[PDB]
CSV table of N, CA and C and ligand atoms in Angstrom, one decimal:
chain,number,residue,atom,x,y,z
Q,1,UNK,N,12.5,-14.1,-16.9
Q,1,UNK,CA,13.2,-14.8,-15.9
Q,1,UNK,C,14.0,-13.9,-15.0
Q,2,UNK,N,14.1,-14.1,-13.8
Q,2,UNK,CA,14.9,-13.3,-12.8
Q,2,UNK,C,15.8,-14.2,-12.0
Q,3,UNK,N,17.0,-13.9,-11.8
Q,3,UNK,CA,17.7,-14.7,-10.8
Q,3,UNK,C,18.3,-13.8,-9.6
Q,4,UNK,N,18.5,-14.3,-8.5
Q,4,UNK,CA,19.2,-13.7,-7.4
Q,4,UNK,C,18.5,-12.6,-6.5
Q,5,UNK,N,17.3,-12.5,-6.8
Q,5,UNK,CA,16.5,-11.5,-6.0
Q,5,UNK,C,15.2,-12.2,-5.4
Q,6,UNK,N,14.9,-11.9,-4.4
Q,6,UNK,CA,13.6,-12.6,-3.9
Q,6,UNK,C,12.5,-12.1,-4.6
Q,7,UNK,N,11.6,-13.0,-4.9
Q,7,UNK,CA,10.3,-12.6,-5.8
Q,7,UNK,C,9.2,-13.7,-5.7
Q,8,UNK,N,8.0,-13.1,-5.9
Q,8,UNK,CA,6.8,-14.1,-6.0
Q,8,UNK,C,6.7,-14.8,-7.3
Q,9,UNK,N,6.7,-16.0,-7.2
Q,9,UNK,CA,6.7,-16.8,-8.5
Q,9,UNK,C,5.6,-17.8,-8.6
Q,10,UNK,N,5.4,-18.1,-9.8
Q,10,UNK,CA,4.4,-19.1,-10.2
Q,10,UNK,C,5.1,-19.9,-11.3
Q,11,UNK,N,5.4,-21.2,-11.3
Q,11,UNK,CA,6.0,-21.9,-12.2
Q,11,UNK,C,5.1,-23.0,-12.5
Q,12,UNK,N,4.4,-23.2,-13.6
Q,12,UNK,CA,3.4,-24.2,-14.2
Q,12,UNK,C,2.4,-24.5,-13.2
Q,13,UNK,N,1.8,-23.4,-12.4
Q,13,UNK,CA,0.8,-23.7,-11.4
Q,13,UNK,C,1.3,-24.0,-10.1
Q,14,UNK,N,2.7,-23.7,-9.8
Q,14,UNK,CA,3.2,-23.8,-8.4
Q,14,UNK,C,3.6,-22.6,-8.1
Q,15,UNK,N,3.0,-22.0,-6.7
Q,15,UNK,CA,3.4,-20.6,-6.4
Q,15,UNK,C,4.2,-20.7,-5.0
Q,16,UNK,N,5.2,-20.0,-5.0
Q,16,UNK,CA,6.2,-20.0,-3.8
Q,16,UNK,C,6.9,-18.7,-3.7
Q,17,UNK,N,7.3,-18.3,-2.6
Q,17,UNK,CA,8.2,-17.0,-2.3
Q,17,UNK,C,9.5,-17.5,-2.1
Q,18,UNK,N,10.5,-17.0,-3.0
Q,18,UNK,CA,11.9,-17.6,-2.6
Q,18,UNK,C,12.9,-16.7,-3.6
Q,19,UNK,N,14.1,-17.2,-3.5
Q,19,UNK,CA,15.2,-16.5,-4.0
Q,19,UNK,C,15.7,-17.5,-5.1
Q,20,UNK,N,15.8,-17.2,-6.4
Q,20,UNK,CA,16.0,-18.1,-7.5
Q,20,UNK,C,17.4,-18.2,-7.9
Q,21,UNK,N,18.2,-19.3,-7.8
Q,21,UNK,CA,19.5,-19.4,-8.2
Q,21,UNK,C,19.8,-20.8,-9.0
Q,22,UNK,N,20.7,-20.8,-10.0
Q,22,UNK,CA,21.0,-21.9,-10.7
Q,22,UNK,C,21.7,-23.0,-9.8
Q,23,UNK,N,21.3,-24.2,-10.0
Q,23,UNK,CA,21.9,-25.3,-9.4
Q,23,UNK,C,22.6,-26.4,-10.1
Q,24,UNK,N,23.6,-27.1,-9.6
Q,24,UNK,CA,24.2,-28.2,-10.1
Q,24,UNK,C,23.4,-29.5,-10.3
Q,25,UNK,N,22.5,-29.7,-9.4
Q,25,UNK,CA,21.6,-30.9,-9.6
Q,25,UNK,C,21.1,-31.0,-10.9
Q,26,UNK,N,21.0,-32.3,-11.3
Q,26,UNK,CA,20.4,-32.7,-12.7
Q,26,UNK,C,19.1,-33.4,-12.5
Q,27,UNK,N,18.1,-32.8,-13.1
Q,27,UNK,CA,16.7,-33.5,-12.9
Q,27,UNK,C,16.5,-34.5,-13.8
Q,28,UNK,N,15.5,-35.4,-13.5
Q,28,UNK,CA,15.2,-36.5,-14.5
Q,28,UNK,C,14.3,-35.8,-15.5
Q,29,UNK,N,14.5,-36.3,-16.7
Q,29,UNK,CA,13.7,-35.5,-17.8
Q,29,UNK,C,12.3,-35.3,-17.8
Q,30,UNK,N,11.5,-36.4,-17.4
Q,30,UNK,CA,10.0,-36.4,-17.2
Q,30,UNK,C,9.7,-35.4,-15.9
Q,31,UNK,N,10.4,-35.5,-15.0
Q,31,UNK,CA,10.0,-34.6,-13.6
Q,31,UNK,C,10.2,-33.2,-13.8
Q,32,UNK,N,9.4,-32.4,-13.2
Q,32,UNK,CA,9.6,-30.8,-13.2
Q,32,UNK,C,9.8,-30.2,-11.9
Q,33,UNK,N,9.0,-30.5,-10.8
Q,33,UNK,CA,9.3,-30.0,-9.4
Q,33,UNK,C,10.4,-30.6,-8.8
Q,34,UNK,N,11.0,-30.3,-7.7
Q,34,UNK,CA,12.0,-30.9,-6.9
Q,34,UNK,C,11.5,-30.7,-5.4
Q,35,UNK,N,11.7,-31.8,-4.6
Q,35,UNK,CA,11.3,-31.7,-3.3
Q,35,UNK,C,12.2,-32.4,-2.3
Q,36,UNK,N,12.3,-31.6,-1.2
Q,36,UNK,CA,13.3,-32.0,-0.1
Q,36,UNK,C,12.7,-33.0,0.7
Q,37,UNK,N,13.4,-33.4,1.9
Q,37,UNK,CA,13.0,-34.4,2.9
Q,37,UNK,C,11.6,-33.9,3.7
Q,38,UNK,N,11.6,-32.7,3.8
Q,38,UNK,CA,10.4,-32.0,4.7
Q,38,UNK,C,9.3,-31.7,3.8
Q,39,UNK,N,9.3,-32.1,2.5
Q,39,UNK,CA,8.3,-31.8,1.5
Q,39,UNK,C,8.0,-30.3,1.2
Q,40,UNK,N,9.1,-29.5,1.2
Q,40,UNK,CA,9.2,-28.2,0.5
Q,40,UNK,C,9.9,-28.2,-0.7
Q,41,UNK,N,9.4,-27.4,-1.7
Q,41,UNK,CA,10.0,-27.4,-3.0
Q,41,UNK,C,11.3,-26.6,-2.9
Q,42,UNK,N,12.3,-27.3,-3.4
Q,42,UNK,CA,13.7,-26.9,-3.4
Q,42,UNK,C,14.2,-26.4,-4.7
Q,43,UNK,N,13.7,-27.0,-5.9
Q,43,UNK,CA,14.1,-26.7,-7.0
Q,43,UNK,C,13.0,-26.7,-8.0
Q,44,UNK,N,13.0,-25.9,-9.1
Q,44,UNK,CA,11.9,-25.8,-10.1
Q,44,UNK,C,12.7,-25.7,-11.4
Q,45,UNK,N,12.0,-26.3,-12.3
Q,45,UNK,CA,12.3,-26.4,-13.8
Q,45,UNK,C,11.3,-25.4,-14.6
Q,46,UNK,N,12.0,-24.4,-15.2
Q,46,UNK,CA,11.1,-23.5,-15.9
Q,46,UNK,C,10.8,-24.2,-17.4
Q,47,UNK,N,9.5,-24.3,-17.7
Q,47,UNK,CA,8.9,-24.8,-18.9
Q,47,UNK,C,9.8,-24.3,-20.2
Q,48,UNK,N,9.7,-22.9,-20.3
Q,48,UNK,CA,10.2,-22.2,-21.5
Q,48,UNK,C,11.8,-22.6,-21.7
Q,49,UNK,N,12.7,-22.5,-20.7
Q,49,UNK,CA,14.0,-22.6,-20.9
Q,49,UNK,C,14.7,-24.0,-20.6
P,1,UNK,N,21.5,-35.1,11.9
P,1,UNK,CA,20.8,-35.2,10.6
P,1,UNK,C,20.6,-33.8,10.1
P,2,UNK,N,20.7,-33.6,8.8
P,2,UNK,CA,20.5,-32.3,8.2
P,2,UNK,C,19.2,-32.2,7.3
P,3,UNK,N,20.3,-15.6,5.8
P,3,UNK,CA,19.3,-16.7,5.6
P,3,UNK,C,19.1,-17.5,6.9
P,4,UNK,N,17.8,-17.3,7.5
P,4,UNK,CA,17.4,-18.1,8.5
P,4,UNK,C,17.6,-19.7,8.3
P,5,UNK,N,17.2,-19.9,6.9
P,5,UNK,CA,17.3,-21.4,6.4
P,5,UNK,C,16.4,-22.3,7.2
P,6,UNK,N,15.3,-22.6,6.4
P,6,UNK,CA,14.0,-23.5,6.9
P,6,UNK,C,12.9,-22.7,6.2
P,7,UNK,N,12.3,-23.3,5.4
P,7,UNK,CA,11.1,-22.5,4.7
P,7,UNK,C,10.0,-22.0,5.5
P,8,UNK,N,9.5,-22.9,6.5
P,8,UNK,CA,8.4,-22.4,7.3
P,8,UNK,C,8.7,-21.7,8.7
P,9,UNK,N,9.4,-20.7,8.4
P,9,UNK,CA,9.7,-19.8,9.5
P,9,UNK,C,10.4,-20.6,10.7
P,10,UNK,N,11.1,-21.5,10.5
P,10,UNK,CA,11.8,-22.3,11.4
P,10,UNK,C,13.4,-21.9,11.6
P,11,UNK,N,13.7,-21.4,12.8
P,11,UNK,CA,15.2,-20.9,12.9
P,11,UNK,C,15.9,-21.6,14.1
P,12,UNK,N,17.2,-21.7,13.9
P,12,UNK,CA,18.0,-22.4,14.8
P,12,UNK,C,18.9,-21.2,15.4
P,13,UNK,N,19.0,-21.0,16.6
P,13,UNK,CA,19.8,-19.9,17.2
P,13,UNK,C,21.1,-20.6,17.8
P,14,UNK,N,22.2,-20.1,17.4
P,14,UNK,CA,23.5,-20.6,18.0
P,14,UNK,C,23.7,-20.4,19.5
P,15,UNK,N,24.3,-21.4,20.2
P,15,UNK,CA,24.4,-21.3,21.7
P,15,UNK,C,25.4,-20.2,22.1
P,16,UNK,N,25.2,-19.7,23.3
P,16,UNK,CA,26.0,-18.6,23.7
P,16,UNK,C,27.5,-19.0,23.7
P,17,UNK,N,27.7,-20.2,24.3
P,17,UNK,CA,29.0,-20.7,24.4
P,17,UNK,C,29.4,-21.6,23.1
P,18,UNK,N,30.3,-21.3,22.4
P,18,UNK,CA,30.7,-22.0,21.3
P,18,UNK,C,31.3,-23.4,21.6
P,19,UNK,N,31.3,-24.3,20.6
P,19,UNK,CA,31.9,-25.5,20.8
P,19,UNK,C,33.4,-25.6,21.3
P,20,UNK,N,34.1,-24.7,20.6
P,20,UNK,CA,35.5,-24.5,21.0
P,20,UNK,C,35.7,-23.9,22.3
P,21,UNK,N,34.7,-23.0,22.8
P,21,UNK,CA,34.7,-22.4,24.1
P,21,UNK,C,34.6,-23.5,25.2
P,22,UNK,N,33.6,-24.4,25.0
P,22,UNK,CA,33.3,-25.5,25.9
P,22,UNK,C,34.4,-26.4,26.2
P,23,UNK,N,35.1,-26.7,25.1
P,23,UNK,CA,36.4,-27.4,25.2
P,23,UNK,C,37.4,-26.9,26.2
P,24,UNK,N,37.5,-25.5,25.9
P,24,UNK,CA,38.4,-24.9,26.8
P,24,UNK,C,38.2,-24.9,28.3
P,25,UNK,N,36.9,-24.9,28.6
P,25,UNK,CA,36.4,-25.2,30.0
P,25,UNK,C,36.7,-26.5,30.5
P,26,UNK,N,36.5,-27.5,29.6
P,26,UNK,CA,36.8,-28.9,29.9
P,26,UNK,C,38.2,-29.1,30.1
P,27,UNK,N,39.1,-28.4,29.3
P,27,UNK,CA,40.6,-28.5,29.4
P,27,UNK,C,41.0,-27.8,30.8
P,28,UNK,N,40.3,-26.7,31.1
P,28,UNK,CA,40.6,-26.1,32.4
P,28,UNK,C,40.3,-26.9,33.6
P,29,UNK,N,39.1,-27.5,33.7
P,29,UNK,CA,38.8,-28.4,34.8
P,29,UNK,C,39.8,-29.5,34.9
C,1,LIG,C1,10.7,-22.7,-27.5
C,1,LIG,O1,10.9,-21.4,-28.0
C,1,LIG,C2,12.1,-21.1,-27.3
C,1,LIG,C3,12.1,-19.5,-27.6
C,1,LIG,O2,12.2,-19.3,-28.9
C,1,LIG,C4,13.3,-21.9,-27.6
C,1,LIG,O3,14.5,-21.4,-27.0
C,1,LIG,C5,15.6,-21.2,-27.8
C,1,LIG,O4,16.1,-22.4,-28.4
C,1,LIG,C6,17.2,-22.2,-29.2
C,1,LIG,C7,17.5,-23.6,-29.8
C,1,LIG,O5,17.7,-24.6,-28.7
C,1,LIG,C8,18.3,-21.6,-28.5
C,1,LIG,O6,19.5,-21.4,-29.4
C,1,LIG,C9,17.9,-20.2,-27.9
C,1,LIG,O7,19.1,-19.7,-27.2
C,1,LIG,C10,16.6,-20.4,-27.1
C,1,LIG,N1,16.0,-19.2,-26.7
C,1,LIG,C11,15.5,-18.4,-27.6
C,1,LIG,C12,14.9,-17.2,-27.1
C,1,LIG,O8,15.5,-18.7,-28.8
C,1,LIG,C13,13.1,-23.4,-27.3
C,1,LIG,O9,14.1,-24.1,-27.9
C,1,LIG,C14,11.7,-23.8,-27.9
C,1,LIG,N2,11.3,-25.0,-27.6
C,1,LIG,C15,11.1,-25.7,-26.6
C,1,LIG,C16,11.3,-25.4,-25.1
C,1,LIG,O10,10.6,-26.9,-26.7
């Protein structure tokens, strides 16, 4: 896992280019991706950790 | 309603005259 550097990532079959940082937001247990108003992924949950 | 900031290459550029500056002009007039 990498934090705070721009990187090409794939999380459970979702591919995006972004900078990864820890967030305060608490996801619902069943859901994995997070999406904003404009339908761009804003948060992701790593399966392993 | 609510880093370039906007995923799809969308950027907002700040106005030449700031909000504070415009108020000063209004005060002057
Ligand atoms: C899957 O395996 C990983 C890696 O062994 C587990 O992660 C660890 O979990 C323990 C107990 O919660 C922690 O104390 C460690 O810090 C975690 N990391 C490692 C490297 O051990 C994980 O708990 C396991 N199970 C899942 C995700 O279901």
